[PDB]
């Protein structure tokens, strides 16, 4: 099955599950998402505030956590276990 | 024992299956059932005195299906009635 | 009689099985937000984000480490929103690596039949850019709405 | 990609070409053997590097020799 | 058309072909030139397809090889009955088996090994056997060692008969190819003549010999005063005093009054409380039923009498819209290829041996089988290893059928052609379910190890933590316990005691069986088992499917079966062969079967095997630690591999010290395997070149050139030592631990 | 072998009974039982179903070594072309799966090359070997001081 | 394409009466009241509002009644298309 007039159809370049419908939403739903997700578009810009915002948000709740929230900030609550040879 | 229900079933299970194998109602050596359960004639090579094609294999085969079916009817009716 | 080759071609590595080209399956897969080739890729990326955002609150509130406290709504939703923010950066660095700014689309233009269609804009440097922001806003809203419907309104369910 | 080199110890037995699965080797005329032919590798960019030619070479030591160098999609043997 | 085709004197019985070693192969008939000739001499010794292209002589070779195998097995059975007759305490064990261990091997007092002749009981010294022959002879009704000696010399007579038949069917009257291609007659005479009449004859033995002798053995009668087996046949009043249904004398059989045979043909179920083994009225009804059912199934196919089935007509009518021309040519596959039939027969025999292992711990068929824990562990472990080896060999000969007997012209658009046409889908979806099973079982184990290490026992997968109860197994076990009341009426008890019907059977103060619990630990280890079986299927099925060709090597069928590689090209084509997939599936069989027998040993040492004291209290060997420690790898290393190995390492200076020696030597053979597996041929070849130089210096060079082992041979030697060393390690640890605590 | 000899010659010196080494080091069952099994008593009991001790990180690092070392066997026994055909099937599966075919690779997925396979198995073997012994050696002397 | 399994909406009807006409007859074997209203007693008894059946007699009948439905109502799928196609 080789054609020499359509090179994509004879090699497997098929949109197997694609659709050519232009739109199925309405204008009210579409204008809401592009307004809110307009500052999240650029890859270089989005990678900057996700690293800087992600480093702050793990250091905040890592430090403001309580004893019941995380056991490493609870500390010891009993007498320490003495090892052998008096150590 | 002759008039008992074991004897009357086992006679009639053997007789009707030999009747079916002789009068062309059951599969036999000289006639084959296909996937459509249709009786088509074949030459098995076995020669007896029957003009229909009943041979010594079928009287052992239909006697066995007279007995395999006939044992199950007798003990099926023994546990039920 | 039931199995065909892929678009009649036996030498492409696939088959037209009932799990691939059913009347029901090929209707389904053609309406899923990833295979809309003419919708703008920020809008269909919000639906890919709302979905995955919602579903991920479930295994993080019912199985996580803080599942036996009263903070199980707050701990698991921020854990579900944390996987959104990581996968947004995984979506960010994928579009930086795969697609270059100013290039064409690495997408099959031809459909199942011989009709010529427009190129899919998702496999571009700007199409995956708006797709990444669609997953970030949709994912953070999909987590927050599943947190609202579970631990703010507290709707009755057998397991919550 | 891979560099296949033919040396002057070759007897023109042709079995390096017959063992080649990617059509690298061919027999060119030569004046240094009884068979009056030596192998050569013009399509050495198509060489996978399998060294089937070195397994089929009866000359001690080998006349065909494959050196595994820079590997591309020809010499990796991929279909994807 | 089915009739006897043989021909007379194909090859003359001569020793001139014994003197030439490599006579079967054209390459080895020239004599040796390197030391690899010796290894290809043994590698191609049994490979009859590589010798000749004629399937008739191949089939004659296989038939006489079957007879030689039967001779070897009859010599082995002769030895095991002679060891019961002369070197055992079988009469002493048969007097009372709850205190005397089964022993049938006496060693010679030569080098300090006479300590291995331990105190097994009954005034006897010897190696305590774990093969189960004593319980088998008790179930056979064997009372004296004269019967064991008679069975040994009868087996020697049959071994001479198999040797004579192997000589006869290769040198005097050997069959032709169409005799072996009568597969309908062979199935008719294997189903009816072999498995039907064999079950009928053993049913007759278990009516006349096993049943009254084993009934007298339940009554506490001494075996020296029990009447001999022919006295029940002769004096039928002696047989009638134990079963009154024998007083009628074969008239209820032909008058269909089979319920009057309800005294000795029962559907009881469960175990004998006297012995702990299945009832022989049930085992005799079982054999009579599978005989009246295998003899029925042996009258199915068409030989030459008109009635029957041509199985080509069965296959060629089985075709579907998802396949098209399926099942066609598979008769030509299975009558012109020995390897395809060998693949199917090996898969059924290995899976069947696994069925045997499960249906013997769970429904112990022999008296005092269950309470002798050494026999139960060794029989399950042995049959699991044999079954795993035979299913790996099934995939092996499947792959040999692909590389040497698969004709693509006769197989177009059938099942096999389409399975080859989508083998990427099969291997990729198998790969996905293997990775999914690997995470969702072993990563669950890693999660339990991590939260048990991090001091979070509530964050685990325990019976007290997040539960993963096997609700399907826990329902099928209740369905099999609550069966006799409604779905299987005519049963006195239930099929097995491990279902949940109570009946705490105590034989000799030791637990035969009880209800087996299934919890989170059993769920985790069964998902380990499913994962390991699936991965073994993945390597083995990948070797079967990619035996012909691949995306990597499209001419792999021309390279053969036992080829190492194509070379360092295409990135490296190491272990592309189907043989190498059998080689890796041998390791995955080690992993699968070893975790199976480890789960077995820990599960029944923790939840089944133990002792019963007064007032119905059951103390197991490792009490209740399977539900809490077998969910972590540290418990498996600690409460199984360390706590239960506290009898294989301090067995020194005792009768079980040979298990310590073979435990350590099995570690040696395993670490010796890692020399062959991790290394390669060219290093050893140049080291041998240095050694050959040292031999040339002192004029002790052999003319047979010293060579390193081949890459296929180096992998074969490595996997042989890996399986031998690891299996012998588990054998030594098992047979020291469960003998010591049993 | 060197550090087995060091740790067992010293682990019997430090608690006094040098006769245990003087009677048991001459045969390998003494090495297996009185050194590898006896000193590992409080190693693998670092965490239990009942609870966890201070050696628990050394009990995990011991098991961790038995993972990585054995994982090296996967690279040292199984060799390349099995995994290359496996990754070929995986590449087909990714290239034909709906919703996942959209994601591409720029690097073509191949198996680990032969030198790389020997190096990865060797490094796994070494990491498992140094972590199994670092754990056992720092848990069978620091939990039973002497 | 798009006809991997044709509907032919009588096999769903003949398979419906293929597991009500030969499946709702009372039998003397096991003293069953009916073959399928004891199998339909699961909705009659084990039906609970969000508190479902656990360790129950429902799971068996259902696992037979559906297995009989997936061996008879699919047997007409072979049976009707075997008449339509050249199969026997
Ligand atoms: C008057 C005729 C008649 C009657 C009413 C019966 C009735 C009986 N037969 Mg019978 N039978 C008959 C004809 C008949 N048979 C014939 C023609 C054959 C010859 C092929 C048989 C051969 C036969 C077999 C081989 C079996 C019976 C059995 C039974 C019982 C049915 C058990 C059941 O429901 O299993 C229900 C079973 C399932 C729902 C699943 C079973 C799945 C298996 C175990 C795998 C019952 C007493 C059985 C029995 O135990 O006899 C007392 C049995 O073993 N019969
Ligand atoms: C003593 C009688 C006798 C003699 C002289 C011959 C003569 C011949 N035989 Mg043999 N044959 C005989 C008995 C005899 N056979 C029997 C008893 C069998 C049944 C097994 C056969 C079946 C048979 C086959 C199927 C084949 C022959 C063929 C051969 C030829 C040489 C093969 C060879 O090297 O043999 C020497 C072989 C051996 C010494 C191996 C014997 C192995 C025995 C069975 C024991 C194996 C198990 C044993 C316990 C070892 C286990 C391992 C151990 C470490 C514990 C030669 C014409 C071959 C032929 O003509 O083809 C070219 C051929 O393929 N024979
Ligand atoms: C599966 C086969 C098998 C196995 C492994 C055994 C195993 C053994 N047998 Mg044998 N045995 C066998 C077959 C078997 N036998 C058969 C078929 C017979 C009947 C003829 C015997 C007859 C028998 C006797 C007569 C004796 C043994 C003994 C021996 C032991 C030493 C053998 C030896 O050193 O001989 C070296 C080789 C030659 C002498 C030749 C060993 C444990 C001896 C034993 O256990 O004494 C305590 C001993 O006296 N066996
Ligand atoms: C009713 C007759 C009958 C019976 C009983 C068997 C029985 C057997 N066949 Mg056979 N066979 C027969 C007819 C029969 N065959 C027919 C008609 C064909 C031709 C189409 C074949 C062709 C065939 C081949 C090619 C092979 C067998 C093999 C086998 C053996 C199975 C392997 C095994 O370990 O089993 C358990 C083994 C035993 C229980 C040993 C029993 C041995 C005694 C002496 C009986 C065998 C002799 C004879 C077949 C029946 C005589 C009955 C006698 C007791 C009165 C077994 C001996 C295989 C084998 O091992 O080859 C040797 C093999 O692959 N058969
Ligand atoms: C192949 C197996 C086999 C064989 C050789 C025997 C052999 C015998 N049976 Mg039978 N029998 C068997 C299967 C077998 N039976 C089974 C499985 C059952 C259950 C139906 C019995 C139950 C049975 C009874 C009830 C009696 C015999 C009897 C007989 C004897 C005379 C019949 C004869 O030889 O023909 C003979 C010793 C009679 C006898 O003499 O008892 C010892 C007798 O009365 N048989
Ligand atoms: C019903 C059983 C059965 C059948 C008929 C065969 C038949 C065959 N196998 Mg095998 N196979 C099976 C099951 C079986 N196998 C199982 C169990 C496995 C898994 C291990 C395989 C895996 C398989 C592969 C991987 C291949 C075959 C091949 C062979 C062929 C010839 C091998 C040869 O010459 O022997 C050679 C015999 C030896 C080298 C003897 C060594 C025995 C083992 C490996 C080591 C010793 C084990 C022993 C118990 C330990 C004792 C130690 C002590 C001495 C110190 C032949 C067709 C080969 C072939 O080319 O097929 C065409 C081959 O490539 N087999
Ligand atoms: C303990 C040693 C070890 C481990 C970890 C592996 C791991 C693997 N083997 Mg195996 N195998 C081993 C030894 C090992 N093997 C040896 C001895 C051999 C040589 C014979 C083989 C050779 C080999 C073959 C030939 C095959 C496997 C395959 C696989 C995979 C099975 C699927 C699975 O479990 O995915 C889950 C992964 C794991 C359980 C590994 C641990 C990962 C943890 C749980 C995740 C958390 C870590 C975290 C992300 C870190 C941050 C997996 C990657 C099969 C494969 O690739 O297809 C499925 C395959 O076909 N094995
Ligand atoms: C019974 C077991 C012995 C069977 C021997 C059968 C056989 O090979 O001998 C039959 C052999 C056949 O004779 C063969 O003849 C050949 C030439 O045609 C060669 O000379 C062979 O060496 C010779 O074995 O007859 C003999 O001459 C007997 C000697 C060999 C047997 C020695 C037994 C030890
Ligand atoms: C185990 C059951 C899995 C269901 C499979 C089953 O029901 O098979 C149904 C289907 C039967 O196909 P046909 O109707 O062509 O079968 C006629 C048979 O006689 C085969 O010749 O088999 C397949 O197409 C295999 C599909 C396996 C799909 C992947 C499953 C893994
Ligand atoms: C000549 C003649 C005649 C006659 C005929 C007849 C009458 C016949 C008969 C025949 C018969 C009448 C036959 C029969 C047969 C039988 C058989 C063949 C059987 C078999 C059996 C078996 C198979 C087995 C059994 C069993 C069972 C089933 C179950 C279980 C038990 C037992 C095992 C026992 C007439 C008059 C017509 C006319 C003139 C001529
Ligand atoms: C050690 C080793 C060798 C060398 C193995 C050899 C040479 C086998 C040695 C067999 C014996 C020991 C020599 C032959 C013995 C003779 C029968 C002479 C008898 C002398 C005494 C044994 C009595 C390989 O060839 C090899 C190949 C591929 C991967 C790994 C390896 C590998 O590890
Ligand atoms: S195989 Fe070797 S000797 Fe023969 S032609 Fe090729 S290079 Fe020359």
UniProtKB/Swiss-Prot annotation, chain D:
GO terms for cellular component: chloroplast thylakoid membrane; photosystem I. Its main location: plastid. It is a peripheral membrane protein. [4Fe-4S] cluster 1 binds at residues 10, 13, 16, 57. GO terms for molecular function: 4 iron, 4 sulfur cluster binding; electron transfer activity; metal ion binding; oxidoreductase activity. InterPro entries: 4Fe4S_Fe-S-bd (IPR017896), 4Fe4S_Fe_S_CS (IPR017900), PSI_iron-sulfur_center (IPR050157), PSI_PsaC (IPR017491). It is an enzyme of class 1 (oxidoreductase). It comes from the Eukaryota. [4Fe-4S] cluster 2 binds at residues 20, 47, 50, 53. Binds 2 [4Fe-4S] clusters. Cluster 2 is most probably the spectroscopically characterized electron acceptor FA and cluster 1 is most probably FB. The keyword rRNA processing does not apply. Residues 1-30, 38-67 form the 4Fe-4S ferredoxin-type domain. Its EC number is 1.97.1.12. Its cofactor is [4Fe-4S] cluster. It is found in: Plastid, Chloroplast thylakoid membrane. GO terms for biological process: photosynthesis; photosynthetic electron transport in photosystem I. It catalyses: reduced [plastocyanin] + hnu + oxidized [2Fe-2S]-[ferredoxin] = oxidized [plastocyanin] + reduced [2Fe-2S]-[ferredoxin]. The keyword Amino-acid biosynthesis does not apply. Keywords: 4Fe-4S, Chloroplast, Electron transport, Iron, Iron-sulfur, Membrane, Metal-binding, Oxidoreductase, Photosynthesis, Photosystem I, Plastid, Repeat, Thylakoid, Transport. The eukaryotic PSI reaction center is composed of at least 11 subunits. Apoprotein for the two 4Fe-4S centers FA and FB of photosystem I (PSI); essential for photochemical activity. FB is the terminal electron acceptor of PSI, donating electrons to ferredoxin. The C-terminus interacts with PsaA/B/D and helps assemble the protein into the PSI complex. Required for binding of PsaD and PsaE to PSI. PSI is a plastocyanin-ferredoxin oxidoreductase, converting photonic excitation into a charge separation, which transfers an electron from the donor P700 chlorophyll pair to the spectroscopically characterized acceptors A0, A1, FX, FA and FB in turn. This is Photosystem I iron-sulfur center. The lineage of its organism: Eukaryota, Viridiplantae, Streptophyta, Embryophyta, Bryophyta.
Swiss-Prot record, chain E:
It catalyses: reduced [plastocyanin] + hnu + oxidized [2Fe-2S]-[ferredoxin] = oxidized [plastocyanin] + reduced [2Fe-2S]-[ferredoxin]. Its main location: plastid. It comes from the Eukaryota. Pfam families: PsaA_PsaB. P700 is a chlorophyll a/chlorophyll a' dimer, A0 is one or more chlorophyll a, A1 is one or both phylloquinones and FX is a shared 4Fe-4S iron-sulfur center. GO terms for biological process: photosynthesis. GO terms for molecular function: 4 iron, 4 sulfur cluster binding; chlorophyll binding; electron transfer activity; magnesium ion binding; oxidoreductase activity. [4Fe-4S] cluster binds at residues 565, 574. The chain crosses the membrane at residues 62-85, 148-171, 187-211, 283-301, 338-361, 377-403, 425-447, 523-541, 581-602, 656-678, 716-736. It is an enzyme of class 1 (oxidoreductase). Belongs to the PsaA/PsaB family. This is Photosystem I P700 chlorophyll a apoprotein A1. It comes from Physcomitrium patens.
Swiss-Prot record, chain F:
This is Photosystem I P700 chlorophyll a apoprotein A2. PsaA and PsaB bind P700, the primary electron donor of photosystem I (PSI), as well as the electron acceptors A0, A1 and FX. PSI is a plastocyanin-ferredoxin oxidoreductase, converting photonic excitation into a charge separation, which transfers an electron from the donor P700 chlorophyll pair to the spectroscopically characterized acceptors A0, A1, FX, FA and FB in turn. Oxidized P700 is reduced on the lumenal side of the thylakoid membrane by plastocyanin. Chlorophyll a B3 binds at residues 74, 82. The lineage of its organism: Eukaryota, Viridiplantae, Streptophyta, Embryophyta, Bryophyta. Chlorophyll a B1 binds at residue 66. The PsaA/B heterodimer binds the P700 chlorophyll special pair and subsequent electron acceptors. PSI consists of a core antenna complex that captures photons, and an electron transfer chain that converts photonic excitation into a charge separation. The eukaryotic PSI reaction center is composed of at least 11 subunits. Belongs to the PsaA/PsaB family. It comes from the Eukaryota. The chain crosses the membrane at residues 55-77, 119-139. It is found in: Plastid, Chloroplast thylakoid membrane. Phylloquinone binds at residue 83. The chain holds residues 589 to 734 of 734 of the full protein.
């Amino acid at each position: 099955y080789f054609d020499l007039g359509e090179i994509d159809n004879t090699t497997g370049n098929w949109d197997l599950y694609g659709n050519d419908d232009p739109n199925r939403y309405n204008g009210f739903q579409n204008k809401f998402f592009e307004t809110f997700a307009g500052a999240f578009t650029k890859r270089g810009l989005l990678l900057k505030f996700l690293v800087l915002g992600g480093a702050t948000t793990i250091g905040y709740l890592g430090s403001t956590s309580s004893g019941d929230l995380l056991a490493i900030k609870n500390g010891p609550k009993q007498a320490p276990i003495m090892g052998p040879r008096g150590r | 024992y002759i008039g008992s229900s074991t004897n009357l079933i086992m006679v009639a299970s053997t007789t009707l299956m030999l009747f079916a194998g002789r009068f062309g109602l059951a599969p036999s050596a000289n006639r084959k059932s296909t996937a459509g359960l249709k009786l088509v004639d074949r030459d098995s090579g076995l020669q007896t005195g029957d003009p229909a094609g009943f041979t010594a294999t079928d009287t052992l085969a239909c006697g066995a299906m007279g007995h395999v079916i006939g044992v199950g009817i007798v003990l099926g009716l023994k546990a039920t009635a | 009689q039931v199995i065909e080759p892929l678009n009649g071609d036996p030498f492409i590595g696939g088959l037209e099985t009932p799990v691939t080209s059913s009347p029901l399956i090929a209707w389904y897969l053609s309406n899923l937000p990833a295979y809309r080739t003419a919708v703008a890729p920020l809008l269909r990326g919000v639906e890919i984000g709302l979905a995955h955002g919602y579903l991920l609150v479930g295994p993080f509130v019912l199985a996580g480490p803080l599942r036996n406290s009263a903070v199980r709504g707050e701990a698991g939703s921020l854990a579900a929103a944390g996987l959104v923010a990581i996968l947004t950066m995984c979506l960010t660095i994928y579009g930086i690596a795969s697609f270059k700014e100013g290039e064409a689309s690495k997408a099959p233009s031809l459909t199942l039949t011989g009709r010529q269609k427009a190129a899919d804009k998702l496999q571009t440097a700007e199409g995956w850019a708006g797709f990444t922001g669609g997953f970030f806003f949709g994912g953070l809203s999909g987590v927050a709405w599943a947190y609202i419907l579970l631990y703010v309104l507290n709707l009755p369910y057998p397991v919550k | 990609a891979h560099s296949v080199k033919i040396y002057d110890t070759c007897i023109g037995c042709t079995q390096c070409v017959r063992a080649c699965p990617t059509d690298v080797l061919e027999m060119v005329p030569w004046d240094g053997c009884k068979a009056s032919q030596i192998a050569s590798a013009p399509r050495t960019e198509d060489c996978v590097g399998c060294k089937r030619c070195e397994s089929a070479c009866p000359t001690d030591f080998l006349s065909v020799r494959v050196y595994l160098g820079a590997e591309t999609t020809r010499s990796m043997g991929l279909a994807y | 058309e089915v009739k006897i085709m043989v021909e007379k004197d194909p090859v003359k019985t001569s020793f001139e072909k014994w003197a030439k070693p490599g006579h079967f192969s054209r390459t080895l008939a020239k004599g040796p030139n390197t030391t690899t000739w010796i290894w290809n001499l043994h590698a191609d010794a049994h490979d009859f397809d590589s010798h000749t292209n004629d399937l008739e002589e191949i089939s004659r070779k296989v038939f006489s090889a079957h007879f030689g195998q039967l001779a070897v097995i009859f010599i082995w059975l002769s030895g095991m009955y002679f060891h019961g007759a002369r070197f055992s305490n079988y009469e002493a064990w048969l007097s009372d088996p709850t205190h005397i261990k089964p022993s049938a091997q006496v060693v010679w007092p030569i080098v300090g090994q006479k300590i291995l002749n331990g105190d097994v009981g009954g005034g006897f010294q010897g190696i305590q056997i774990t093969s189960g022959f004593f319980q088998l002879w008790r179930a056979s009704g064997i009372t004296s060692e004269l019967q064991l000696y008679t069975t040994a010399i009868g087996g020697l007579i049959f071994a001479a008969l198999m040797l004579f038949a192997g000589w006869f069917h290769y040198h005097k009257a050997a069959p032709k190819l169409a005799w072996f291609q009568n597969v309908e007659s062979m199935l008719n005479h294997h189903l009816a003549g072999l498995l039907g009449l064999g079950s009928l004859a053993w049913a007759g033995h278990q009516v006349h010999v096993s049943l009254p002798i084993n009934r007298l053995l339940d009554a506490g009668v001494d075996p020296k005063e029990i009447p001999l087996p022919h006295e029940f046949i002769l004096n039928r009043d002696l047989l009638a005093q134990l079963y009154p249904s024998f007083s009628k004398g074969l008239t209820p059989f032909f008058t269909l009054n089979w319920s009057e045979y309800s005294d000795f043909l029962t559907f009881r179920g469960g175990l004998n409380p006297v012995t702990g083994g299945l009832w022989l009225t049930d085992t005799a009804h079982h054999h009579l039923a599978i005989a009246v059912l295998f003899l029925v199934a042996g009258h199915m196919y068409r030989t030459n009498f008109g009635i029957g089935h041509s199985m080509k007509e069965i296959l060629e009518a089985h075709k579907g819209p998802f396949t098209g021309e399926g099942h066609k040519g598979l008769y030509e596959i299975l009558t012109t290829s020995w390897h395809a039939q060998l693949a199917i027969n090996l898969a059924m025999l290995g899976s069947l041996t696994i069925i045997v292992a499960h249906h013997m711990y769970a429904m112990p068929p022999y008296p005092y089988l269950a309470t002798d824990y050494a026999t139960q562990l060794s029989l399950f472990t042995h049959h699991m290893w044999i079954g795993g080896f035979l299913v790996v060999g099934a995939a092996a000969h499947a792959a040999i059928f692909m590389v040497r007997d698969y004709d693509p012209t006769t197989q177009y658009n059938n099942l096999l052609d389409r399975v080859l046409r989508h083998r990427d889908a099969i291997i990729s979806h198998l790969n996905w379910v293997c990775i999914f099973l690997g995470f969702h079982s072993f990563g669950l184990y890693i999660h339990n190890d991590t939260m048990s290490a991090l001091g979070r026992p509530q964050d685990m997968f325990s019976d007290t933590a997040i539960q993963l109860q096997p609700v399907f197994a826990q329902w099928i076990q209740n369905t099999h316990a609550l069966a006799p009341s409604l779905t299987a009426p005519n049963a006195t008890a239930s099929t097995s005691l491990t279902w949940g019907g109570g009946d705490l059977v105590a034989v000799g103060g030791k637990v035969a069986l009880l209800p087996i619990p299934l919890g989170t630990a059993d769920f985790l280890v069964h998902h380990i088992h499913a994962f390991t079986i699936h991965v073994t299927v993945l390597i083995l099925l990948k070797g079967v499917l990619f035996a012909r060709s691949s995306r990597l090597i499209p001419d792999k069928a021309n390279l053969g079966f036992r080829f190492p590689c194509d070379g360092p090209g295409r990135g490296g084509t190491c272990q592309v062969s189907a043989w190498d997939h059998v080689f890796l599936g041998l390791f995955w069989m080690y992993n699968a079967i070893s975790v199976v027998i480890f789960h077995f040993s820990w599960k029944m040492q923790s939840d089944v095997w133990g002792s019963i004291s007064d007032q119905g209290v059951v103390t197991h060997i490792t009490g209740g630690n399977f539900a809490q420690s077998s969910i972590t790898i540290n418990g498996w290393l600690r409460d199984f591999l360390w706590a239960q190995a506290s009898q294989v390492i301090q067995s020194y200076g005792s009768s079980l010290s040979a298990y310590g020696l073979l435990f350590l030597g099995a570690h040696f053979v395993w670490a010796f395997s890692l020399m062959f597996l991790f290394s390669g041929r060219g290093y050893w070849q140049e080291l041998i070149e240095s050694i050959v130089w040292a031999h040339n210096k002192l004029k002790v060079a052999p003319a047979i050139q010293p060579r390193a082992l081949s890459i296929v041979q180096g992998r074969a030697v490595g996997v042989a030592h890996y399986l031998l060393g690891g299996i012998a390690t588990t054998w030594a640890f098992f047979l020291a631990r469960i003998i010591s605590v049993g | 072998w060197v550090t087995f000899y060091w740790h067992w010659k010293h682990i019997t010196l430090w608690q006094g009974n040098v006769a245990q080494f003087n009677e048991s080091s001459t045969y390998l069952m003494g090495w297996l039982r009185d050194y590898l099994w006896l000193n590992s008593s409080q190693l693998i009991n670092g965490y239990n179903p009942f609870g966890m001790n201070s050696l628990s990180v050394w009990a995990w690092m011991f098991l961790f070594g038995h993972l990585v070392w054995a994982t090296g066997f996967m690279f040292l026994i199984s060799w390349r072309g099995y995994w290359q055909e496996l990754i070929e099937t995986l590449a087909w599966a990714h290239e034909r799966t709906p919703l996942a075919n959209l994601v591409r690779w720029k690097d073509k997925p191949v198996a680990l090359s032969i030198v790389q396979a020997r190096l990865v198995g060797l490094a796994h073997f070494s990491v498992g070997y140094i972590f199994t012994y670092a754990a056992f050696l720092i848990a069978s002397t620091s939990g039973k001081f002497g | 394409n798009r006809d991997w399994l044709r509907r032919d909406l009588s096999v769903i009807g003949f398979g419906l009466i293929g597991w009500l006409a030969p499946s709702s007859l009372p039998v003397i074997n096991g003293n069953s009241l009916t073959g399928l209203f004891l199998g339909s007693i699961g909705p009659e008894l084990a039906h609970f509002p969000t508190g479902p059946a656990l360790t129950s007699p429902f799971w068996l009948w259902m696992v037979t009644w559906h297995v009989g439905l997936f061996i008879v109502l699919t047997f007409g799928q072979i049976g009707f298309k075997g008449r339509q196609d050249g199969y026997w």
